[PDB]
Amino acid sequence: ATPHINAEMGDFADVVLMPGDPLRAKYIAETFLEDAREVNNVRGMLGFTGTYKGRKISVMGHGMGIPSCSIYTKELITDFGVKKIIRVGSCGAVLPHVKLRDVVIGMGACTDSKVNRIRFKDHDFAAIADFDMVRNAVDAAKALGIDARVGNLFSADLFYSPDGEMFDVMEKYGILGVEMEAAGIYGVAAEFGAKALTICTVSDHIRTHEQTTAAERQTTFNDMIKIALESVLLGDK
Amino acid sequence: ATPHINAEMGDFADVVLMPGDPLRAKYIAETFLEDAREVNNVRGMLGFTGTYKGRKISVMGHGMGIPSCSIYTKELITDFGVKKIIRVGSCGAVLPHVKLRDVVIGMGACTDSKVNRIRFKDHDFAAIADFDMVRNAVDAAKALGIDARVGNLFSADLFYSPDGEMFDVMEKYGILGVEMEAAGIYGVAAEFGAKALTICTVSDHIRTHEQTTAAERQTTFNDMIKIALESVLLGDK
Amino acid sequence: ATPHINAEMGDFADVVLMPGDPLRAKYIAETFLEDAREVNNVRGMLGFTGTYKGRKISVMGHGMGIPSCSIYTKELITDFGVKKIIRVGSCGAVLPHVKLRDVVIGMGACTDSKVNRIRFKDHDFAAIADFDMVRNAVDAAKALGIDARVGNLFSADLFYSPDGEMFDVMEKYGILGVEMEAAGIYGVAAEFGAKALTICTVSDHIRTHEQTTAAERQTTFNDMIKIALESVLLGDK
Amino acid sequence: ATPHINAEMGDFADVVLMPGDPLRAKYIAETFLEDAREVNNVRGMLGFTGTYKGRKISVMGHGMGIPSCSIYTKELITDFGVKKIIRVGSCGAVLPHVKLRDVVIGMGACTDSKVNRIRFKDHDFAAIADFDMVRNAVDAAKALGIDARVGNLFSADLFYSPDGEMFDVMEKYGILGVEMEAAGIYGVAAEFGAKALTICTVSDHIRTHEQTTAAERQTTFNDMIKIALESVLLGDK
Amino acid sequence: ATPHINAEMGDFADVVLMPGDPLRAKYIAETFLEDAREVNNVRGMLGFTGTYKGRKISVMGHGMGIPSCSIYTKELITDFGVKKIIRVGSCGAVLPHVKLRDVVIGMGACTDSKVNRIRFKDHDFAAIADFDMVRNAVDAAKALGIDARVGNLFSADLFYSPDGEMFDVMEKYGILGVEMEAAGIYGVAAEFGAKALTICTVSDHIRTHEQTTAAERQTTFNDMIKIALESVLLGDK
Amino acid sequence: ATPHINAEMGDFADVVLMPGDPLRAKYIAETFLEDAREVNNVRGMLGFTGTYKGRKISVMGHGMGIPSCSIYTKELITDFGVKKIIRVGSCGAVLPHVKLRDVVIGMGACTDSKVNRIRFKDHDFAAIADFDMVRNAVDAAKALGIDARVGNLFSADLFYSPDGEMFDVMEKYGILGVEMEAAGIYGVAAEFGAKALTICTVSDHIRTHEQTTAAERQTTFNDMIKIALESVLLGDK
């Protein structure tokens, strides 16, 4: 057990899908995994382990923000033998050509957090995904007929940012999505020698207020999860 | 409704107790509040509103880390008329004379987050509690026979810090407890014109590994909550 | 003696009031202290020791700015046995509802100096007063019928700042007064294990640009000093 | 012409390979290009344009360091219609299992420069390559039987760094190679809307301090260049 | 009159010698100037104006630290027509071959203050003296047969520095003397369009622990004053 | 030999003039030196050694930017007994009263590079030239009847700067010329225990948009070289 995960070595697979919302974790388990067992309830951060076409897979919430997800991802790498983390989340878009419900794959993750500076002697750590995991995700998306853009995310510490102008800077430098975790997860993976990827669906445009249905959200969310799970099977080869 | 709180103006009291763990929120509601109703379930971040000796009070989890609690505290101040936030949490100690299960009141909160620098043109914002709320909490503790130390907390972004030496610096400058939120909450309160306090119990010494029972944890936790609730009644006068 | 104080152990009381202006220290001593003898003249930084209602009290100037007051407060603490320092100064106001001749108590002090960053591994140290001294000061003010505002000061390095935009930011985040020392003194008090408090009167509105009459302002200055002296008597119990 | 390139629109291909050494650009041109004409000599920064298997390709030196290569890459992008830049350089190795003559592809590039902080409001910009170009390069290397490592480079300002401790930190966080340009080039490519990639061969071990034979090292250098040229042919489809 | 100088345009000469200690200003006026007339006593920061070999010369203390001297030097320049400031102070040595009583001329001044960073968009401003004034000072020193070093000072905010290692770094980079003002005066000079020079006398050695001794303070102090005053005369011609 | 200079101890004189352009080094060797002998061609960074009025003098390009010139200047100092570096370059003007073809002497150099911050524990290092060398240069300029300004340069990392406002700040603070090297050369000089000076010729105006024109480049360029060379002679005597 660790302070935030009441479980032992072997309860988690070597690969873990992590939505922000732990309710979405329970939904992943019942919708995609066979023979699923609950492996964590500490703080209501529900975690499960089952199989997807024979492959052992886990899914657990990480919570909003770099500090929350850094706790869970670290404990998984160092205490539960986890080799790969796939964040499966939502993000807001700043580019007019990036559309609602697009799948975005974060090869890199910008941030305004200080966590990587603390790690990297106050220099610029390029918070990057594992390259094979990125390609695996792109190829799985192609096989599912989903076109996916690959590029930079921005991991914000403040959802309610007092710096509105920063969104224009993000746009100028090609940021595909604004979320709150990738740069933290990528930092942890590098620190403790594991691999990570963040995939997000665009749920918001910080531009116009445009609408989606609940049905449209479920279908797009299911597509991201399919992408992530099929990406794992490609990574196994 | 707000993106993280499915509720309307009036569902929350003007004062909100916030543990990190949403399971502890449900426990506060059933143990201390009368006539309690559920007011939030979004992302399993359970929130309740009831009364404590006639006084309308709310309790809801905020999640681990500055970014999580900044979401909820902001939305409460700006969309639900919340005037006071009391964080009710745990912390780790670095001072040998600060003992396990001590009640610590954060008049101020140091941090290694960058959130207040983003707010404060990269200068030093002294993240402080509302003074009356601090005194209210000290006086409530005295009336309950609990001695409480008042001073600085340290709100860490990394629970698993790669900078071990920083704990000695904290100790040298008198930091009473290490937690992950106060400086973020104090920042939000100042930004949006409300009041905040963080009270923590010492659950850990980053020094020796010393033990407590589950019974000892419940009693100390109940004492912190009593302190916080009685502090509100003193603040009403 | 120390490099800036030609005096000996015992020559100061264990509490020292500190205006910025040494001529103001002489003013405090002659007006409020009995049997007052001068105990320092090095660099014209006049220090005095006498009694207030039978309690031994010292008063001494600290000069303008964090670097000047850091020198004096340090030497008093480590070489002259001083346990409490009460800065008694002036500040400019930034909030419209903060009026001329309001008494302001700095529970915290923001700053643009980097002294506390030097001390605190480049993180945010929340420069705070000792809580008991704050409370003693508030109660002493209550007993004299004076309505003390407790909150954040801002300790500036540049009285003539090139960046006028920073005053709006101070206003936004609730800064009660702008002065030049508090954050420095609080850093010293935490570094060397003593206690400190800054009281200020508002002598300036960096908003409306106005006065106020000489007799009324000098009355309020005397009230601040009475609050300081009476607060130490409350601290003795 | 631009201030550092005496040539005209059309004189360069829409892809430019860029070694640091202009004499190396002449080497690339004569060895791998047919019908190669020199298109720039200003400051001795030799640029050439020819064909590789019927595809128009240019090659030109960029000089040592982020500031030098930022100038050339910018001018190519905004004035000579260049859409892709492939840096083909050398790096020093930091990881023990990264060997001499390994081909390294910088999906990302860390840095100690502050150029990207100037661009990105002092936050962390993740300096990344274009994903497709990375994949093209990996596939081209696979087709030639070469085992390319994909990950982080570190773009240093000081070849002779005063801070030897930073090399351990690079090792800890998985940096594959240390060079002087990639982060600069990736910043330019994002600023001005083009695409970039850095390939390096490991010519140095800042760990074991060793060689390796002249024929074998020049063989591996030629393989890097073949990978670069073949990757652009894959990019055309 | 200005907020810290009770005097009128004309009361000061167009060059002002400024020691930190106002009692040294007094001493200088008495010992070196004819017809010496006190032009300021606000805050005991004594200012004088008299004559040196017929040349109108002023001398006023500036207090300890960048914030103190930045106030006075500014007010002199904007409201009293002062064109040249010459700081005449003391410093601590860090180089072993710089010995006690040596005269150092601050061609530049390093600092750990944030003031120049505030002025210069967080970039490195090279805080420099006026060249002609430096040359004037060197020629006056030669003419009086006094040895004089020219180079960098370091203007510290913390006399009692908690970072002992920093002195090794100053040593490494050739710092002739540690004082508390020059970098601020040179910043003010540039900001407000005047000229300045800091000359210092090496009091103690930061390493060795021994301060200015017997009558040797006075002659060495007088040598600096002589240089400064003679340097003004050369500047006129 | 060093990694970027293929030559032996003795091949270089103890002072080296360095333009950015290696073809200017060639031109200088041809036009000003007798018995001129090429001592380096590694990376086309041409180095020469000959005679000026019997004095052994070397001249070598350093490439564009702090990182490029930091490599060469270091290697010259540590492995070829070079005592003095004189950068002889071009700069852009920011002050309207600084006109095209003006000769500027870099007494100090501001910068937006992080290199000196890396060397100086993130504090402000005042990057200065050697005083005697500055004086030598001014006296040689007077003797040749050439006007010469003495003050601060600004060493930029981005020729194509995305921060246009910064030029206003340079203007405000008296920056005589914008170039890309001086602050790095002065840092290297201090780090490795040699002396340096940067002299520049004002090519364009950053505001006005017009570069060095017709034969006036050559005479103005030759005036700088003449000053530099004559300045060496004065330094010997």
Ligand SMILES: Oc1ncnc2[nH]ccc12
């Ligand atoms: O995390 C986020 N930050 C900003 N905007 C957003 N939209 C969806 C997630 C999101």
Ligand SMILES: Oc1ncnc2[nH]ccc12
């Ligand atoms: O939040 C925290 N960070 C570090 N140590 C701790 N102990 C308990 C909470 C805690």
Ligand SMILES: Oc1ncnc2[nH]ccc12
């Ligand atoms: O620094 C300051 N800025 C404006 N007004 C003030 N009063 C006292 C200090 C002060």
Ligand SMILES: Oc1ncnc2[nH]ccc12
């Ligand atoms: O900057 C660098 N440091 C060490 N080795 C290297 N090789 C290439 C650049 C480089």
Ligand SMILES: Oc1ncnc2[nH]ccc12
């Ligand atoms: O200002 C100073 N800081 C440190 N040591 C010193 N000696 C003399 C002045 C001085």
Ligand SMILES: Oc1ncnc2[nH]ccc12
């Ligand atoms: O280096 C430079 N940066 C900006 N403008 C310039 N003109 C000439 C050199 C120069």
